[PDB]
Amino acid sequence: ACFRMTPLYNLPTHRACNMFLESYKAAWILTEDHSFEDRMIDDLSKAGEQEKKPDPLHQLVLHFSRTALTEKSKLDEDYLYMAYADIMA
Amino acid sequence: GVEIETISPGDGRTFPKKGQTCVVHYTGMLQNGKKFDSSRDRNKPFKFRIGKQEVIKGFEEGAAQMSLGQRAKLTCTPDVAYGATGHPGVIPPNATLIFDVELLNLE
Amino acid sequence: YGESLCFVQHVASGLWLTYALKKKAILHQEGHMDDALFLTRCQQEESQAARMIHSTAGLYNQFIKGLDSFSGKPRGPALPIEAVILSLQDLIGYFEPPSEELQHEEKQSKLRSLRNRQSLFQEEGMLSLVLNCIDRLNVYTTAAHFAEYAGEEAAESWKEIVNLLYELLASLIRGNRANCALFSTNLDWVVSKLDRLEASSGILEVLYCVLIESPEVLNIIQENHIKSIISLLDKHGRNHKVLDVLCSLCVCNGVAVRSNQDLITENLLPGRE
Amino acid sequence: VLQMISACKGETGAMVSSTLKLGISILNGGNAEVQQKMLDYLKDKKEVGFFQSIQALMQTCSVLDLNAFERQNKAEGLGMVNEDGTVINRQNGEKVMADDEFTQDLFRFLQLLCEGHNNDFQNYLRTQTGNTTTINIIICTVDYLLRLQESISDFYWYYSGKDVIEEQGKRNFSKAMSVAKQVFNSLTEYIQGP
Amino acid sequence: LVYYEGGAVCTHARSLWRLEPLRISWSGSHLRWGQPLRIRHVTTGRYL
Amino acid sequence: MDILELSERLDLQRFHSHTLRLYRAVCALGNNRVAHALCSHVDQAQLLHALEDAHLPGPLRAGYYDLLISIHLESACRSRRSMLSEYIVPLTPETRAITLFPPGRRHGLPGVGVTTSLRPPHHFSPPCFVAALPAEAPARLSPAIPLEALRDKALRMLGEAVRDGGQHARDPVGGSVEFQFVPVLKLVSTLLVMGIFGDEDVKQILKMIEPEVFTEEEGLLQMKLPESVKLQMCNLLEYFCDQELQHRVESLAAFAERYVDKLQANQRSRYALLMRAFTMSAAETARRTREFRSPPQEQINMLLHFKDDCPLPEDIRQDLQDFHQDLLAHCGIQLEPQSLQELVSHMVVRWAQEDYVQSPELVRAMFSLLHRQYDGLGELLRALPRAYTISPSSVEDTMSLLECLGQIRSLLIVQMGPQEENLMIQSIGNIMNNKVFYQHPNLMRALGMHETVMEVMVNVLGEIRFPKMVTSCCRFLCYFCRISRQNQRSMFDHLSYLLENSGMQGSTPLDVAAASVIDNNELALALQEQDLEKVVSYLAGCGLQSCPMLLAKGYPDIGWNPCGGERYLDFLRFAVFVNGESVEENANVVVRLLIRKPECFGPALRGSGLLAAIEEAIRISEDPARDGPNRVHLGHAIMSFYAALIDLLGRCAPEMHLIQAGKGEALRIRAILRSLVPLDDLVGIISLPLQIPTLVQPKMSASFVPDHKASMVLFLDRVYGIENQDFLLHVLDVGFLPDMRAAASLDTEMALALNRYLCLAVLPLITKCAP
């Protein structure tokens, strides 16, 4: 069956764009290297600039601890916690 | 059957026939004067068709005695409108339906 | 601790106690390869919580059968009335919920200590016998007219211990979803008594917390219950509490129950009175 | 990071996978006060459950599996599915040792808990006095690499017969010891200070 | 009748045992082999 | 009495507000029947009269606002929030012309423009009280409202309410600045996700929230507002970050057909300039690796390979790199506060700079916004598996499916009752002929419709409650698995749970698990061996007791289920056999298990005999009172369980080319399998005749049938075979010659169950032994 497969130019044009995005995603979007985490973590920490209250990083850390202390049955999945553990690390 | 005690008639020459619009601006009332429905507040006149059996029949055949511009406090027996079941949640069974209707135009 | 791995024997007979799930341990003179065990340590809270159970069960059953000794025979032994006054007061305080003005990260340690000591009562009995001591008390309808079986001196405390007995029910049932499932079998218990005219707001608050903790008891009610609920609203004024228990009966945990979302509209809204 | 380990109770989800990376990054380079701040929080709160929720994790770590190995060979015996469907190669892919980079980070974590010859920790990892129960973590690492030994020696007897080693058998053997290099490196940091 | 049990009966109140030695004074001394005692269940108040 | 006395009665206030809690609770979660019922007790005119009165007390102001959106709006609101995240794009020429920056590299406005993604309308219905009662109702719709006037109401309701906060008068509307802003904001947020605001209202709303930036006075984001007012703006600012994300996905999909249509032609021009040239001989195959030798996925992969061996010319490789340089320019990448991202990052940190927040669900929502303004690509990449591109001719049939789908998705929250379970039957049944479900298998799992129909079967299952829907739902799932390749792959993962509900004439959720692995050799050897042992332990459960459903009609209690195995061993038959070939990695592991527990075999295999238990099973098919005493029968069930036991022991015998190689498993598996059932007992089964009807008729449903016999000829054909001559015509004379001459009599119901017993189970045995 390796010979009977169709070329592109016989396809309906609504099906070209379905596989075009799936190619464009994993070859151009994901290949980009962006390093925003350097300057997200410091201005969130230098933000004690006012006129012993916690700076906004200390509020973020204290929030995740109080979610980890409620005696629930099991630890559920918090995707917001996922995108801040590595951003710290 | 129903009875009709009129308030203020209008033309008196016209009466609802078959194949006609029937635009009413009615309100409702339970028998203790505790109302539940009024099309006048939401500013949209009720527009039901004649003879198509989509309105309750106490409103239907009671509208036959009406003329154009006629305003009439009619009433209804329990047997002609929601006899032993009632409208569920709104009105109890075995209850009369005092109305207050008037016809706008177009029979 | 954790390294002993030892045995015991009836040293005045030399007999080794050993088994035969329900392995009945018996004194066997043979001596075998399965009597080696290492022993571990308990904890300071439940060691305290254990002994007061053994005080109460000897105290409650003494109170129980003393009442039944004149269950049918009227008069013309004595009851531990002043004992069960005070021994019910501390059970309220031992099961006291924590306050809202407390710090968060320590309030769960107070809260987890409560939950692991209210379920430690429900499994060593203590729910039958607090129910078995109220039904044989609520056989009497009037205050003293059916307390004439005992006497007028012991009649005054009948009014104000049934206030306490419905209070400690709401103590050890509040928030416990596992203990609130125990009332799926007998919902006609509480609604047979909710207009008993004495401590009438007590049983109402018992029913309110069990209707908010266990969703298993919601789908097992019919309209015979609900007409007995709305009749309470008509006999006891415009109580703001019995609009909450109607609301909590409707939905729970993001789940709606349409089998009685209509049932509290066919008996309220057309009446208009 | 000490609480969310103890709040997991031994489930190999993506939470403990993504919270250990913060742990090995806050403890990287053999830091000193951040592990002194870690000890005294742990030994006055006395929450037993930090040493349960890792003894449960160390038991659920995989070793090599011959009965899973040739399944991955016969899966690789096909190249392209019919009707122009493209087979995702490494979606399931590595079916054996799929949790390696997780368990390569668990021992890497608690090696850094005792990197700078922190003498209190090498006495704390085997016993905890104030808690009601002891765990003896440094015993439990020996039971894990013992399961590595007869795992990979069973892989040797499978390849004792034939002459050469192919490509997929080679790379599965390189994954086999890069975790074993980590567990030896984490074993000697319980012992390095005398 | 005395039995064994599984895992849920472990943390519950029925699986607790008080250790009572014979003489009264120095009762809370350290225990050793060959020291006679009396086992009592803590909720029943009964002795084995 | 006047309602405004309730500011000072203080007992009827807390009683009447608790009544207001009962109205918005009794019609909660889409109860459009009773939402029409208490449209009488509050008419719509007095509802939007008390909506704007100033001197109403505190809780009754937010009481009546909480009734209005829960009597008129939250039904149609909830069926839009669950469909905003998904995207599909049709091909109209309006879609064919859209871009990222407005034509004039300066930004545009959020929510102001065109939007081409599909969204179904709402279909309100007006209330009435004199219509006749119909007599299984179709549905009830939500009660209507004048919407075009209400959108003008809430603007001028807010319009002076913001400048009056600038006046700082200490008599606030409602008694507090909390009650002044909380109900007026949470109505605007619900009218905005309904989408009915015009594209110049949002230009006017954006001037209320931040006038100093959104120019094409006082500011909402500059006043000192308390905690409860803040998170309503976070629910409001959540909308204006989705439309920026929604606009670029619509623009990126529009770039595709702008790009692939001029790239569909560039392979026509590239093939025509190659299909007649006579340049080379060997290097032409390097050109011939695409046009008939590369699949259409991998075709455009190598066409898209250029960054930092390519068939693309230098002209049309440039305009892509002008687009990609513009897309990350549109997001937060600077690519070396007059933007939305720069503002909502500034405001969200200076809130935490000022005060120390205590409410938890503020800072959960507060930090989640600013994460969506730094990692803007990560927001984009987690939505591209939702997008799709659809032909414009098929639009009218898709919305019929979407409107059917949201009818099912709303059913997730209601606890199951007897009326609405009919409302999923045609809701499922209308998907079964939508004509687009059968031709877009990638879209249906990106909608996730197989997940949503899964737990509604689970929640009723949790004895049994409602058999007339579990049969109808799981039958759809079996038809869903038989559409494509990867739809089988998607439903494959849930057999971990689907096996845990093995506990009824008709279909069953166990058969969905068997349909998930049939005819896929890739799935079979990727199946986990930690799942088979709880199937054979389930076989031990049906090997020890009788089911009480057999005791419901007074059949005799026998200490093993005969019909429980036939709903287990059919599944194992698809587990070790694909495309007529026997897999070997699974055939070994199944026979270790069912000999470690011999109770998986019946009580005739421990110490009765095979032919003994068969002969007793024939006789109880004759004596009816000896059988159980309506479609379920007794003696036919036992003689079908042992018959369907052997054929899996048949097709787990190893393939013959693994016997020429002497692989020690493949001739010790055969050793155990030859040891269990002896050869001579197989001769007794195959030699037994039957009652024939002519061209009178026996009843095959409780009788001996050749379907038991075909599992005996197959077992001998694999583990025993035919070697010498004298064994062949011995069993040919006593086995087949009684049947096939009797089968030649009818040259009809019984014959059709007899000829196919010959025509595909014993006659291929003959052509194998022909020399």
Numbering used by the authors:
A (entry chain A): 3634 to 3684, 3693 to 3730
B (entry chain H): 1 to 107
C (entry chain A): 341 to 360, 372 to 427, 434 to 630
D (entry chain A): 3779 to 3972
E (entry chain A): 244 to 291
F (entry chain A): 1648 to 1751, 1758 to 1788, 1793 to 1873, 1923 to 2014, 2020 to 2047, 2091 to 2216, 2222 to 2262, 2267 to 2369, ...
Q: Which of the paper's sentences describe this entry?
A:
The molecular target of diamide insecticides is the ryanodine receptor (RyR), a large ion channel expressed in the membranes of the sarcoplasmic and endoplasmic reticulum (SR and ER). Diamide insecticides directly engage and activate insect RyRs, causing uncontrolled Ca2+ release, leading to tonic muscle contraction, paralysis, feeding cessation, and eventually, death of the insect. Therefore, we designed a series of insect-like chimeric RyRs that contain the diamide-binding pocket from Sf RyR and the remaining parts from rabbit RyR1 (rRyR1).
The individual mutations R4563K, F4564Y, C4657I, and L4792S (rRyR1 numbering) significantly decreased the EC50 values for both FLU and CHL, with the largest decrease observed with the L4792S mutation. To gauge the impact of diamide binding to chiRyR, we also obtained a structure in the absence of diamide. This reference structure, termed ref-chiRyR, was solved under the exact same experimental conditions as the diamide-bound structures, including Ca2+, caffeine, ATP, CaM1234, and 2% DMSO. Notably, the structures of ref-chiRyR, chiRyR-FLU and chiRyR-TET all adopt an open conformation, as indicated by the distances between the sidechains of Ile4937 in diagonally opposed subunits.
